[PDB]
């Protein structure tokens, strides 16, 4: 869950960060889930930090599903350059999120362990989150 293997157009217009989650608002694979309540970017490197924390905290226990994939590339201009002269080069890959977009899913592990793991993941992550269970009823 790091980078797209290939993209057609490598320099792209930045994403819209205003509105609500187009989809992925439900726990489908796992049992418990973690959704977001604000809307920032995710940079293919903070989710890496988060899945490590969760996985290593479960001690290779139950399964994990990352629901957010970093698709959008972003650019940064070289240091101390003036304005103009083209667009800069790719610095990282991102995936915008929206309030209500589930991010991580877990199953095959007790409820309290899952809540603790998703808590520890939440702090390595730049968006306010919430703990959710597989919606039923």
């Amino acid at each position: 869950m790091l980078l797209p293997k290939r993209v057609k157009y490598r320099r792209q217009h930045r994403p819209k960060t205003t509105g609500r989650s187009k989809g992925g608002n439900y726990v489908t694979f796992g049992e418990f889930g973690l959704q977001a309540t604000t809307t920032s970017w995710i940079t293919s490197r903070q989710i890496e930090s988060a899945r490590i924390a969760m996985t290593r905290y479960m001690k290779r226990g139950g399964k994990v599903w990352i629901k957010i994939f970093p698709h959008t590339p972003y650019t940064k201009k070289p240091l101390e350059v003036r304005m103009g002269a083209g667009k800069g080069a790719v610095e990282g890959w991102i995936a915008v999120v929206k309030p209500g977009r589930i991010l991580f899913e877990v199953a095959g592990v007790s409820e309290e362990v899952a809540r603790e793991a998703l808590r520890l993941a939440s702090h390595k992550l730049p968006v306010k989150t919430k703990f959710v269970k597989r919606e039923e009823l």
Binding site: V81, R82, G84, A85, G86, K87
Partner: protein, 82 residues
Amino acid sequence: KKGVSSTKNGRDSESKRLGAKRADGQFVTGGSILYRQRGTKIYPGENVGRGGDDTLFAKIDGVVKFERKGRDKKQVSVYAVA
């Protein structure tokens, strides 16, 4: 002003004022272009012709009416009563 950094994409053509040129209901004289296009976004219908440039022009005088052909194609017509 920066320095040597340069881009390989600063080029474009002049847009061609295509699209519609008359609306349903107005009196067009014969020859009036109704819809400059490429390929066939709209086929000619009754009393309407196809130019070499896929342009659509009325054959005769009359009113203009856009209509449906089949499921996913549109034509144009001209009717003379005025």
